[model samples]
Target chain A: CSPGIWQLDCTHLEGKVILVAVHVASGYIEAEVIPAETGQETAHFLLKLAGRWPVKTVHTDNGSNFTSTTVKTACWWAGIKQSMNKELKKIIGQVRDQAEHLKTAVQMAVFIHNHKRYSAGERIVDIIATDI
Target chain B: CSPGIWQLDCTHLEGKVILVAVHVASGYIEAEVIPAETGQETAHFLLKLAGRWPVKTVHTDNGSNFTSTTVKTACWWAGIKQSMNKELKKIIGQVRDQAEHLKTAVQMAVFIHNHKRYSAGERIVDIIATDI
Candidate 1:
């Protein structure tokens, strides 16, 4: 329920950019393969997911593409606030190094993140759904 | 002018938030003092100045307040893209350490940044005003 925890980032995989989004509370996540590292493309990716979640804000690092006019305009029009995420960026950096199977890698990461339980001893998705 | 190089940051002064916006290429800048570092307040500040410049994008670092829904939504509505700025963050951090007179400090910094000549051999404001 805390929008502040959501994070977004892009990692390079085999010359392509992989954009990922995560809802930290539930670990509900999504990713996309973008043609290039352009702000307009990133904005389009985020916009596609807007209807799926109540993305009130966006988290990212200092990527020029994310800071470009096209991306900014898209986020603004969609009514999303943006934040910087250094810790998340570091994680993405590691992912880039092992992104040969990025498509499957991202899916697996999300699954583990969503299925794992933290302090409450309940899966993240379940916690999000029922506040266990 | 290109919008990619613009930067934005918030510094603390006597426990208050001093928000600053700058066009990196021209070094044109503006700053404001806010009661606190809240997303709503930050959004309002950026929106107020939207009409003054052709602000198509925004740059910032990971500050919880800046990434909140209130601020994200404001930028989205205003058609601005948000970016992360690590270099600017470092500079702002230094400013925070010496912010006893934050109001004057921010003003003086902006003044120097705007008035000083950069690579083009002309003042920042002048370059911005006429592409010197």
Candidate 2:
């Protein structure tokens, strides 16, 4: 029996920062934008995306927001194991991009940053399957 | 937009204490036992239940484990809003049990404590619809 694991990170494009979570089993995605980081605002930034997936261990980087108390507290209360580092494709198996996709998502990030915004800071976040 | 909310509490029957969470919308339940409380162990007790629900606000009493830094930090990372107090039926609306279910879930708690264990600590643990 296995609970799905997810990988999370804040990737930036142009100038905006986005928090994206990937389902390791299905390649499903939930993404949003953060105007800034370092507290509850950032935690809420991550929260909306959380509603989209049932997660087990959430892997993310040590970015200021990911490592902040607010973010960590929320994860704990939600019953998730919050860990740092590890790439998606590596776990996805036979993946690509070493530091490039790890530190930043690049072209994919660029597309969404310019895609549209739900509010000044919030983007039109979508939950989608990679199988398509 | 509205998201489903949930409440969590620790209840003991006989000699066991279980960390239980109820989905506010559907009356779904997730419960488990804690040999001892404090830190990540409690978080994991809560986590197995976390697997049963997609949660928003997790309501709990400020027991030692609930208030601990590690527990709080994990809640933060999961992007859940962890708060103190509040009842399931009240939020579920027009419900029963003032301090009875509030302080601890008794009859419900009693059944499970005697209900068989998954491995000594972990229960068989299930995800089921309240409608059933």
Candidate 3:
């Protein structure tokens, strides 16, 4: 409700660490290859999203990377509330492929997912693509 | 979080009434042709869902069919919590075709939407399809 809820989650693909962030309001997702998904690392990513849109809240599964004291303090200082949902990852995880180059793999996966339509044929990209 | 937040809304197709209800937790939707979209008519529909699941909460746009004394009372009796949204229709609305027979149209539309996969390529039907 406040600048939309950004869902942040981490997953392991081919032994590489990847962090996914989704702007729930727009369904526009960003997947980053983090050297490590430590609290400090993810907190840095959350602050970056705040710069893009006054990110007010983030939903996560309470993993050590997300709910650690460092990450908790970061959100508190940024006025961002924290929450959780497994379904978000289920939706965002479907596009990963271990065969492709991880960097390009994540990029193409997000692009395909973003350009695609929802149940009613509405594009996730359409919400944020107007250049507004 | 109990049964799921069912989002109910009405739209007109060729002047014929259609009531749509979505199980938000599973993203599974049910659309029915109502002779009339009065509070009583919609209220009846809500009770049916409770029989299917405990139906803890229902969200609607406050239309007469959803918020009138009859519908409100229906939820009160069912222990349902009512809320609102427009984006749901946008996703569910894309399947309607005025040219087809209305009843069959809604059924086919919902089937197509229901059968389709989400951004992560997971089918909505997969959630509730098993004979669990």
Interface RMSD of each: 23.1, 16.3, 20.5
Recovered native contacts, candidate 2: 0.00
lDDT of 1 by residue, A1-132 (tens): 573355678876557777767666645455555678777667666654442334567776645656678677656755677632233344445654543445433433433333334421122223333321
Q: Pick the candidate with the highest TM-score.
A: 3
| lDDT of model 2 at position B24 | 49
The 10-residue segment with the lowest total lDDT in model 3 chain B: B119-128
DockQ of each: 0.01, 0.02, 0.01
- Candidate 1 regions exceeding 4 Å error are A1-132, B63-65, B83-101, B118-132
For candidate 3, lDDT tens digit of each residue in A89-115?
344356444323464445435544444
Tens digit per residue, CA lDDT, model 1, B7-102: 667766457777777666655566666678777667666654442344567766645656688677656755677632233344455654543445
Worst 10 residues of 1 chain A by lDDT: A119-128
The regions of model 2 sitting more than 4 angstroms off are: A1-132, B63-65, B83-132
lDDT of 3 at B29: 64
Question: lDDT winner among the candidates?
Answer: 3
User: Worst 10-residue stretch by lDDT in candidate 1 chain B?
Assistant: B119-128
